[PDB]
Amino acid sequence: GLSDGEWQQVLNVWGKVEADIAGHGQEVLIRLFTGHPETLEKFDKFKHLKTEAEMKASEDLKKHGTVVLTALGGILKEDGHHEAELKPLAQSHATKHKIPIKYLEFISDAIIHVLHSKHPGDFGADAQGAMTKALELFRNDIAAKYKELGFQG
Amino acid sequence: GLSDGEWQQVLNVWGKVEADIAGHGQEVLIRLFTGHPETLEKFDKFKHLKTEAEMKASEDLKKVGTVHLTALGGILKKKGHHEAKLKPLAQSHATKHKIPIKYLEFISDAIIHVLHSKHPGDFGADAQGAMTKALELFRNKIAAKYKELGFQG
Numbered sequence A: 001g002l003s004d005g006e007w008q009q010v011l012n013v014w015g016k017v018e019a020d021i022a023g024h025g026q027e028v029l030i031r032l033f034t035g036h037p038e039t040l041e042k043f044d045k046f047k048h049l050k051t052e053a054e055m056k057a058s059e060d061l062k063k064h065g066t067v068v069l070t071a072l073g074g075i076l077k078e079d080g081h082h083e084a085e086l087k088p089l090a091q092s093h094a095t096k097h098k099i100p101i102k103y104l105e106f107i108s109d110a111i112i113h114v115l116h117s118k119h120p121g122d123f124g125a126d127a128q129g130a131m132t133k134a135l136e137l138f139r140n141d142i143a144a145k146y147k148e149l150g151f152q153g
Numbered sequence B: 001g002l003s004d005g006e007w008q009q010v011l012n013v014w015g016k017v018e019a020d021i022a023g024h025g026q027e028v029l030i031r032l033f034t035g036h037p038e039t040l041e042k043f044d045k046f047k048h049l050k051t052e053a054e055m056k057a058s059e060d061l062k063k064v065g066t067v068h069l070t071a072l073g074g075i076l077k078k079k080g081h082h083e084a085k086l087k088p089l090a091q092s093h094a095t096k097h098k099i100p101i102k103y104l105e106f107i108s109d110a111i112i113h114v115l116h117s118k119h120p121g122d123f124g125a126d127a128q129g130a131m132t133k134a135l136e137l138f139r140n141k142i143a144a145k146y147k148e149l150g151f152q153g
């Protein structure tokens, strides 16, 4: 993930892109296509364009550049939003309840144990592997939030 | 992240937990407390409880068990939803447009180049490092979606 400061930098820069999204979009695609002409082959609508001046004059290329950067902006904003979801829970557990990361592991093991006990026939190896991994990813996320709160070691 | 199949298994098992959330919650906490008595110290409301019969009768313990599993269920659902966000984009780019991951690298570089060019002084080393990381994480997510689609190149 990104740190809180890193996310701020990402969102700040993207506000500048959004102030001229069309121009950014155009320049990005032109830069892509001139540095890596093989990428232009993938765009049926304008793979015939041969020069930068031809690319600049293409209204469709400009439209597509906007579509691409708009979609990416959304993706980045959603990533940032998702990474912020556990902030309040990590805050309360780190500083109010005072819970080591290790205790999150203990409760994860307990969850797995209970599921196995209560669901004979319905919590097979694959299902158990999936849940184990989901809970591990959760713990890692909380650990990264702890780090943003000044707990590392 | 988890595979689509792994997410299905996780969400399927959780539906069973939600069919008896209170009972699951209670058993999880009792398991946690009996395997790891030190964890019980963290709960001021019932850290005095000593026997299984006591923990099983405790209203407060059953209540907190439900709070914990309800919150975890929401977290897991949001994670699953987030991991599914890029599915349509990966689908079109893998099988319709046929775009190698390497080409996502090229467009990432092009983005960074354009940002640097258009915002001298407003895209310093740290900001550039942050954006580089964000784009790398995006690429890695698309790569994981490509893998779920059987798509190598």
Ligand code: HEM
Binding pocket: A039, A040, A042, A043, A044, A045, A064, A067, A068, A069, A071, A072, B088, B089, B092, B093, B097, B099, B103, B104, B107
């Ligand atoms: C930041 C990376 C990218 C984003 C966010 C992105 C996003 C999009 C979006 C939203 C569309 C419109 C809907 C769709 O057909 O899936 C699209 C179309 C397309 N993308 Fe991308 N894309 C990216 C990278 C690439 C790269 C690197 C290539 C090729 C080298 C590529 C080739 C295409 C093509 C050929 C289309 C169809 C465009 C049309 O025919 O009008 N994309 N892309």
Ligand code: HEM
Binding pocket: A088, A089, A092, A093, A097, A099, A103, A104, A107, B039, B040, B042, B043, B044, B045, B064, B067, B068, B071, B072
């Ligand atoms: C899957 C892991 C966990 C989840 C989802 C979770 C969630 C919650 C939630 C939602 C609350 C209520 C709101 C809040 O205070 O932040 C809470 C409170 C609490 N959590 Fe957790 N927690 C987890 C793990 C743990 C563990 C492992 C411990 C201790 C060993 C712990 C100790 C506490 C305590 C002491 C409270 C305060 C309870 C009260 O007021 O009675 N938590 N937790």
